[PDB]
Design a protein around this ligand. Structure first.
Ligand SMILES: *[C@@H]1O[C@H](CO)[C@@H](O[C@@H]2O[C@H](CO)[C@@H](O)[C@H](O)[C@H]2NC(C)=O)[C@H](O)[C@H]1NC(C)=O
Ligand SMILES: *[C@@H]1O[C@H](CO)[C@@H](O[C@@H]2O[C@H](CO)[C@@H](O)[C@H](O)[C@H]2NC(C)=O)[C@H](O)[C@H]1NC(C)=O
Lengths: 194, 242
């Protein structure tokens, strides 16, 4: 590009911008989600003895969209960072990569997919790890957005991160909802269990 | 109760094998049973997880069982799906066994330009029959051109968003960069100077003369502004071998 009158040579677009059309008065900066960088991109140097410009090397022509698993929040940039842990970039050229949907999790940097939460766990939007479902509640299906309390007369199968709710047996009774079994003592009773 | 992976039922028993692993196409019936108990083993494509069940639960879409007696079936690896037959069969149109039209599982129909100037939509017509996704009795099929499966266990292969394409194979990818290879889990942006505005396209579309595509993965071509023009004779869409 060039913006000054009467120039013997154009000027290469700097890293972080591009000139997609001929005769551009001003170089246009890269939009968010895209980056341009050409390390070989020189601007001509004038030979003082002869006032002849030399050494011009053409810069970036078109923006490079950021690959899968990478996002670029800001413009005027020369590279894009791997997506923060708990978020994923499943497309190319993303302004800001989306957080993992509830029921999923992503414990790694730069990933383009969210792993699903295992049985007995739950997770909301984002999520470093699948949260172990609290006592008295159960998540029987993988990738559960939230784990529901055990119904009255029933008890969770585990003190923490329950996977199923079972009915109180013959001769027992569960008054409160959210009952859960406890390993200590008898396996059929808990602090609020049957 | 019968052990997991087996089933006992009065009205039927035995196993009905996978028809898509046999050249005949007729599913071979076996009678594999557990040794100590005697209950018939669960047929391929179905799993018996619990103790003593009458019938076998077909595997959920996105999962496959390939051995008689599973108790559980694993999820399809990324880049693979759960469709009847392998990728070759569900993409085929010719018939070998004239008795039952095997293996013409006309399940992949894509609308595009065909041989000759005519534009057919879709290139394969008729009432689609082989569409089942639950019982995957054999190894998972490869994704059809224009679809991807990034994370293992997906029920249905998802289509490529507009602006991106997915070819049948790297060797047959007409417009793809040298360093890129396809496997079933990636969606490549349309090459600069081309575009795509339809989901699940196996090839980008050339931008017609009078327009241009100055950015990678453009959903729609850009109209040349007044004072400028573009005309390239060699530019043409990709024709489909019927
Ligand atoms: C070529 O040299 C010119 C100076 O004449 C540079 O123009 C400026 O570059 C800076 C970045 O280094 C930008 O912030 C300014 O906006 C540019 N000025 C204008 C008027 O656009 C140009 O960047 C140089 N090229 C390279 C590759 O360094
Ligand atoms: C490739 O096919 C596309 C899609 O049919 C063509 O794009 C159309 O072109 C016409 C002019 O020929 C435009 O009026 C339409 O708006 C375009 N359609 C779309 C959906 O963008 C394109 O022309 C074909 N390419 C070539 C080189 O023939």
């Amino acid at each position: 590009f060039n913006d000054e009158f009467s120039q013997p040579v154009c000027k290469a677009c700097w890293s972080g911008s591009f000139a997609s059309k001929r005769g551009l008065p001003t170089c246009e900066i890269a939009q968010p989600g895209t980056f341009t960088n050409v390390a070989a991109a020189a601007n001509a140097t004038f030979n003082t003895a002869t006032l002849i410009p030399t050494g011009l090397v053409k810069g970036a022509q078109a923006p490079t969209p950021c690959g899968m698993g990478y996002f670029q929040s800001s413009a005027e940039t020369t590279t894009c960072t791997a997506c923060a842990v708990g978020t994923y970039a499943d497309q190319a050229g993303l302004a800001a990569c989306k957080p993992c949907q509830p029921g999923r999790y992503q414990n790694s940097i730069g990933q383009r997919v969210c792993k699903p939460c295992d049985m007995g766990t739950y997770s909301r939007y984002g999520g470093e790890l699948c949260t172990k479902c609290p006592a008295g509640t159960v998540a029987s299906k993988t990738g559960s957005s939230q784990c529901t309390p055990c119904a009255a007369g029933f008890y969770a199968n585990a003190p923490d991160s329950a996977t199923s709710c079972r009915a109180c047996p013959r001769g027992y009774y569960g008054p409160y909802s959210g009952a859960y079994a406890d390993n200590l003592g008898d396996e059929f009773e808990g602090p609020r269990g049957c | 109760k019968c052990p997991p992976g087996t089933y006992r039922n009065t009205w039927f028993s035995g196993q009905l094998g996978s028809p898509f692993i046999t050249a005949d196409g007729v599913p071979v019936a076996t009678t594999l049973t557990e040794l100590g108990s005697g209950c018939s083993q669960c047929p391929p494509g179905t799993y018996a997880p619990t103790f003593g069940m009458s019938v076998c639960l077909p595997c959920p879409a996105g999962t496959f069982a390939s051995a008689p007696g599973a108790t559980a079936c694993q999820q399809c690896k990324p880049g693979t799906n759960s469709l009847m037959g392998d990728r070759t069969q569900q993409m085929a149109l010719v018939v070998t066994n004239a008795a039952n039209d095997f293996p013409a599982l006309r399940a992949y129909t894509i609308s595009g330009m065909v041989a000759g100037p005519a534009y057919a939509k879709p290139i394969v017509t008729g009432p689609d029959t082989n569409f089942f996704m639950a019982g995957k009795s054999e190894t998972c099929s490869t994704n059809l051109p224009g679809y991807y499966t990034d994370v293992d266990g997906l029920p249905i292969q998802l289509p490529c968003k507009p602006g991106t394409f997915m070819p049948f194979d790297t060797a047959t990818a007409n417009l793809l960069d040298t360093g890129l290879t396809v496997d079933g889990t990636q969606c490549y942006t349309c090459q600069t100077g081309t575009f795509n505005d339809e989901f699940s396209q196996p090839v980008c579309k050339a931008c017609w003369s009078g327009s241009f595509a100055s950015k990678r993965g453009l959903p729609t071509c850009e109209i040349a502004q007044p004072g400028t023009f573009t005309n390239v004779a060699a530019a043409a869409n990709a024709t489909f071998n019927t």
